[PDB]
Amino acid sequence: LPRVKHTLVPPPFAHAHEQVAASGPVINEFEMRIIEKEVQLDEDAYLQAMTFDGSIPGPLMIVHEGDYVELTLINPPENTMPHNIDFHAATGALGGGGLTLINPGEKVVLRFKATRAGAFVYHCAPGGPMIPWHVVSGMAGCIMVLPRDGLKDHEGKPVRYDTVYYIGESDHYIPKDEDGTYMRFSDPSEGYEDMVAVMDTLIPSHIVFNGAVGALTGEGALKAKVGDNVLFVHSQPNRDSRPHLIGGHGDLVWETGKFHNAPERDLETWFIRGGSAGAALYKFLQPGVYAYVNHNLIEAVHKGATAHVLVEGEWDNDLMEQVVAPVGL
Amino acid sequence: LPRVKHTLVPPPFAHAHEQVAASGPVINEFEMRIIEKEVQLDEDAYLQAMTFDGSIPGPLMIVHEGDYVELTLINPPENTMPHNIDFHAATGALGGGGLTLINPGEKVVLRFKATRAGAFVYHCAPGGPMIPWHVVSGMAGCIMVLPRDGLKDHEGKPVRYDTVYYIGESDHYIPKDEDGTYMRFSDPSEGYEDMVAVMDTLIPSHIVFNGAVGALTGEGALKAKVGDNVLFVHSQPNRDSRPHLIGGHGDLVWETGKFHNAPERDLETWFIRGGSAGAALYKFLQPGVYAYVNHNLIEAVHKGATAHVLVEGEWDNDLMEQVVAPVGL
Amino acid sequence: LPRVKHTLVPPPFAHAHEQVAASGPVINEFEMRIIEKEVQLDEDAYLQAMTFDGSIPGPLMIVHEGDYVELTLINPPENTMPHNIDFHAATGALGGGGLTLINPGEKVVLRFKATRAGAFVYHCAPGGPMIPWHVVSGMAGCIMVLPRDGLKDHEGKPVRYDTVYYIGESDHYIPKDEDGTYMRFSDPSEGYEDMVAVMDTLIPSHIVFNGAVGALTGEGALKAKVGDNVLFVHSQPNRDSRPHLIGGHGDLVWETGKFHNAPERDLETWFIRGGSAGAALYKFLQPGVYAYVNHNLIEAVHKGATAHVLVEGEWDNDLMEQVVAPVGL
Ligand SMILES: O=N[O-]
Ligand SMILES: O=N[O-]
Ligand SMILES: O=N[O-]
Ligand SMILES: O=N[O-]
Ligand SMILES: O=N[O-]
Ligand SMILES: O=N[O-]
Ligand SMILES: [Cu+2]
Ligand SMILES: [Cu+2]
Ligand SMILES: [Cu+2]
Ligand SMILES: [Cu+2]
Ligand SMILES: [Cu+2]
Ligand SMILES: [Cu+2]
């Protein structure tokens, strides 16, 4: 088999790829470096993060069904924790968790066959209580396994996207000092017991896209043009989400994320099961600002789960028109 | 195009309509008036509500796929807030939110084309933090866009309902005084900061059908007869629900709510994604009292999410029979 | 019609049955005894349980679509509560609830026709507030109604399992003494008011498989061999779950649980709606330890929702291989 090396791009973007496989099965080589660091979630709020390649989420990997994935995972010596990786895309050894546990200052190389098409979470899962703590510290990402013959719709005809954005949603449990302010810590372990108490309540303090409140707004706002077919791949490794495109729809949605399943059409809001990634296509019809949200609007607005899409193009009054502008009674 | 004016009926009922379109595409004219008022949720519990037409939920609008909807929205001068409307049925301008923001004492007229069949939430969404607050104050409703050729089942054959009921479920976050009693306020704004703290916990104090605990029980109990095919359209603008008909089933269920998708059959309980409306048909087989619930039974019973259906007709012992009555051991 | 008597086996196992019906419609006789008892949920944590046959969940009953089910339900005189049973599999009388309410020291015999294929919750539901309390005390179980002609896949071809395990997930609301320790009580009623306060927060203290933390680990660990097609039937009577097989997938999944619906394939995680039971088949490919979890990993690890599967067989390096073992940088 040919081998193909890849250079990962941080989310929400995607490394280069073909939808329809150019070749026969290949071996896909990726490398990631584990990075522990405090990140800023919001104006007043920080997280002792544990990341794949410095990002929340970890970067998107793309391959085709029946390729192999061979990943060099590196845990640099300044890190304080063992770490590993579980690919939900993979068969055996706890998704690879059982074969990839590395200490600060080790590497490991795992190969699995991508026997199943879909977008799949991958996350760290060291063992027992370390499993939820590491995930809720940001250590999760997504791999997308495209059918060899590109995407097909509900009746088997090819559909093609012009753009893919990877939206990684994550819940976090930032504990608070006696004064009601979020706590800062020097390292993750110092934060461990107080994070646990928050985690036990199952109420996230933040729920964010691409690692921070507003990360996908302002300078981070996603971009498209009328007529673009955009694929929105959305992961949530630990808790449910109900993605909605305000002003738009899901044209084709695989909310359970697996491309050989029939997608649903015309959805207003769909459902991402915690522990999973889903995918929705939408072809933009109208220019202007859109917002992509978790539709528990408390989660979208008070917790952080809002992204913006800026869309240029010609407006169509047939689809919508302000007939009479805001006027006195 | 012909224009058709409609007189809205408050939920759970529906204004008059045809399932199969009588005509070609038409323009559907609706008008609603925004009403802010304290409503009573339960014996000891009140809400500073913000409503479309005085009801929680806002009334059901019905049209056919490819019609237009032209809505006059009015915000009377005694109201204290700007308000707007986002139709999830609509394409562009944040579902119409961006073109319908009106101050107390203004109106606006929005037209959109109903290009997509299904039941869809519509809700107020003024901007930022006002978005979740206004929704959780009751400002949401549903529009149903029926395929031109009526409803079809999993294999494309026509199915027809004899009755539709619109069940609008809403979560609310009523804050409490120091003594553990729910607070009352003079206006919504006075309640804003204390409601926010409750909202941040993501735990609703109430979760109600048609605006109040027991609203669809007693005098409000829904009604049918053995042999009636009833469509139960169920909205939840902000939080998930898991509707179940006790004693019954969903014969055909579009839990994501969009009629061109294949429905599922024989369901015991289905799932309404927060931010969405779904629909289930059931043809009654047995007379007697049924309960329609959110099947987190804590939500159904402690929070308010229970409705009753009273069904008359002949009992069938073949389906169920008490073989031996309650007798001593 | 023939009558067939059954001897129930406690979960996670299943009484003997045929997948494809041996005979024409029959009458299935079952008997269960209600048992109230304190059970141990975790090292430091007990529940005033109310059970069908002494187990959480109550045992799995299996029949074929169009059979009848005739159940003798017995409430022994040492119990302190009335109790009843609602089969979600059943049509009329609140799933049988309305015809089966028995006092301590009575029995009742209910017959219903199993007109609908799928796995269905059955639970106690005495009336009003007793409904959620009795369920969250463990009184729920599952009945599985197999199509007469066995299971079929997405395109109608027969699929056959070698093993079925019934995984019953339950949320519990164990209140705590002033010192932060879980309370013990002498009887359920003594615990009623303090459990209620916990229930009102909607945050479970425990969320367990087969009635206790670790119940399906260690000596309880599920077992299979490479090449076994295992059916995992998973119930949750009151709250949602997101089952995931770590190291595996759902080959065919009916997450809403009803076998005449098309299953989805290749799922990483699926969704069990509170108030329902779902089913997933998986044919093991790799030997070793797997974990079956609720993929809110806080729920899986901090709350109790983890089971283990121990699988023997030959390892396949084509599916996965540790290319380079854990080595220094
Ligand atoms: O396949 N997107 O360039
Ligand atoms: O319609 N977006 O909340
Ligand atoms: O279409 N119901 O009268
Ligand atoms: O079966 N109704 O809770
Ligand atoms: O049908 N399992 O022996
Ligand atoms: O991939 N199991 O958390
Ligand atoms: Cu880690
Ligand atoms: Cu996982
Ligand atoms: Cu408003
Ligand atoms: Cu919305
Ligand atoms: Cu009971
Ligand atoms: Cu039930």
Establish whether A142 is an annotated binding residue.
no
Nearest alpha carbon, ligand 2 atom 1 = A246
Instruction: Tell me which amino acid residue B298 is.
Output: I
- How far CA A186 is from CA of A47, A48, A74, A80, in Å, comes to 10, 8, 22, 12
B142 and B218 within one domain: no
B230 bridge partner residues: B163, B282
Pairing of strands C276-283, C229-236: antiparallel
User: In angstroms, what separates the C-alpha of C310 from chain A's closest C-alpha?
Assistant: 11
Cα gap B73→B51, rounded to integer Å? 12
Interchain CB contacts (distance < 8 Å): A and C: 170
- How far CA C251 is from CA of A260, B90, C161, C254, C282, in Å, comes to 12, 37, 12, 10, 5
Question: Of all helices (H) and strands (E), which one includes residue C195?
Answer: helix C188-200
A234 interface with B at CB cutoff 8 Å: no
Cα gap C193→C3, rounded to integer Å? 44
Instruction: Tell me which amino acid residue A52 is.
Output: F
Kindly state the tokens that stand for A9: 């791009």
* Cβ atoms < 10 Å from Cβ of A313: 15
Find how far residue C128's CA is from the centre of its chain: 24
B241 and B140 within one domain: no
Q: Is C19 in the pocket of ligand 5 (CB under 6 A)?
A: yes
Kindly state the tokens that stand for B220: 């409000």
B115 interface with A at CB cutoff 8 Å: yes
Backbone angles phi, psi at B292, to 5 degrees: -105, 120
Find how far residue A275's CA is from the centre of its chain: 11
B106 interface with A at CB cutoff 8 Å: yes
Cα gap A292→A94, rounded to integer Å? 33
B182 and B60 within one domain: no
3-state secondary structure chain B: CCEEECCCCCCCCCCCCCCECCCCCCEEEEEEEEEEEEEEEECCEEEEEEEECCECCEEEEEEECCCEEEEEEEECCCCCCCECCEECCCCCHHHHHHHCCECCCEEEEEEEECCCCEEEEEECCCCCCHHHHHHCCCCEEEEEEECCECEECCCCCEECCCEEEEEEEEEECCCECCCCCECCCCCHHHHHHHHHHHHHCCCCCEEEECCECCCCCHHHCEEEECCCEEEEEEEECCCCECEEEECCCEEEEECCCCCCCCCEEEECECCECCCEEEEEEEECCCCEEEEEEECCHHHHHHHCCEEEEEEECCCCCCCEEEEEEEEEC
Backbone angles phi, psi at A143, to 5 degrees: -120, 135
Q: Do A299 and B125 touch (CB under 8 A)?
A: no
A172 and A70 within one domain: no
* Long-range contacts of C148-156, Cβ-Cβ distance < 8 Å, separation of 24 or more: C148/C20, C148/C21, C148/C64, C148/C65, C148/C66, C149/C20, C149/C21, C150/C19, C150/C20, C151/C19, C151/C231, C151/C259, C151/C281, C152/C259, C153/C252, C153/C263, C154/C252, C154/C262, C154/C263, C154/C264, C154/C265
Q: Which residue has the tokens 């056919």?
A: B64
Cα gap A46→A42, rounded to integer Å? 7
**Residues sharing a CB contact under 8 Å with residue B18, sequence separation 6 or more, in sequence order:** none
Find how far residue C154's CA is from the centre of its chain: 24
A193 and A121 within one domain: no
Please list the alpha-helical segments (H only) found in chain A: 130-135, 188-200, 297
Secondary structure (3-state) at A220: helix
Q: Do A322 and B108 touch (CB under 8 A)?
A: yes
Going by the DSSP 8-state scheme, the letter that residue A162 receives in this structure is: S
Ramachandran area for residue C62 (φ above 0: left; ψ -120 to 50: alpha; else beta) = beta
Q: Which residue in C52, C326, A155, A272 sits closest to B271, CA to CA?
A: A272
Of B98, B122, B147, the residue that ends a domain is: B147
Q: Do A246 and B271 touch (CB under 8 A)?
A: no
Dihedral of CA atoms A181, A186, A188, A194 in degrees, nearest 10, equals: -40
CA atoms within 13 A on the CB side of C234: 33
- Burial profile A272-301: b = 16 or more Cβ within 10 angstroms, e = fewer: bbbbbbbbbbbbbbbbbebbbbbbbbbbbb
C173 and C45 within one domain: no
Kindly state the tokens that stand for A111: 């190969």
User: In angstroms, what separates the C-alpha of B50 from chain C's closest C-alpha?
Assistant: 26
Kindly state the tokens that stand for B118: 């299904």
Catalytic status, residue C15: no
C201 and C133 within one domain: no
* Cβ atoms < 10 Å from Cβ of B240: 24
Q: Which residue in C137, C174, C175 sits closest to C57, CA to CA?
A: C137
B138 and B277 within one domain: no
C136 and C210 within one domain: no
Secondary structure (3-state) at C274: coil
Pairing of strands C250-254, C158-159: unpaired
A197 interface with C at CB cutoff 8 Å: no
Supply the CATH number for residue A21's domain.
2.60.40.420
Q: Which of C202, C241, C255 to mutate to test the interface with B (most CBs of B within 10 A)?
A: C202
Q: Which residue in B160, B164, B163, B159 sits closest to B144, CA to CA?
A: B164
Is B250:B280 a contact under the CB 8 Å cutoff?
Answer: yes
* Long-range contacts of C185-188, Cβ-Cβ distance < 8 Å, separation of 24 or more: C185/C38, C185/C48, C187/C36, C187/C48, C187/C80, C188/C36, C188/C48, C188/C49, C188/C50, C188/C80, C188/C81, C188/C137
**Residues sharing a CB contact under 8 Å with residue A290, sequence separation 6 or more, in sequence order:** A245, A246, A247, A248, A308, A309, A310, A311, B94
C94 and C24 within one domain: yes
Of C131, C147, C163, the residue that ends a domain is: C147
Instruction: Tell me which amino acid residue A55 is.
Output: S
Of B147, B162, B179, the residue that ends a domain is: B147
What is the domain range of residue C57?
1-147
Secondary structure (3-state) at A22: coil
Secondary structure (3-state) at C67: coil
Ligand 3 neighbours, Cβ below 6 Å, are B 17, 19
**Residues sharing a CB contact under 8 Å with residue C156, sequence separation 6 or more, in sequence order:** none
> In the PDB record, what is the listed experimental method?
X-ray
Is B89:B62 a contact under the CB 8 Å cutoff?
Answer: no
Kindly state the tokens that stand for B183: 């607070």
**Residue positions counted in chain B:** 329
Backbone angles phi, psi at B249, to 5 degrees: -150, 170
Catalytic status, residue B134: yes
A131 and A176 within one domain: no
Catalytic residues of A: 83, 86, 88, 123-124, 134, 139, 244, 268-269, 295
* Cβ atoms < 10 Å from Cβ of B219: 7
Domain count, chain B: 2
| C-alpha gyration radius of chain A | 20
Is B211:B39 a contact under the CB 8 Å cutoff?
Answer: yes
A143 bridge partner residues: A61, A120
Going by the DSSP 8-state scheme, the letter that residue C199 receives in this structure is: H
Instruction: Tell me which amino acid residue A34 is.
Output: I
- Cis before A57? omega within 30: yes
A179 and A125 within one domain: no
CA atoms within 13 A on the CB side of C300: 30
- How far CA C180 is from CA of A174, C174, C175, C176, in Å, comes to 21, 11, 9, 5
**Portion 277-296 of A in contact with B at CB < 8 A:** 285-286, 288-291, 293, 295-296
Give chain C's end-to-end CA distance (angstroms, integer): 73
**Portion 42-81 of C in contact with B at CB < 8 A:** 70, 72, 74, 76-77
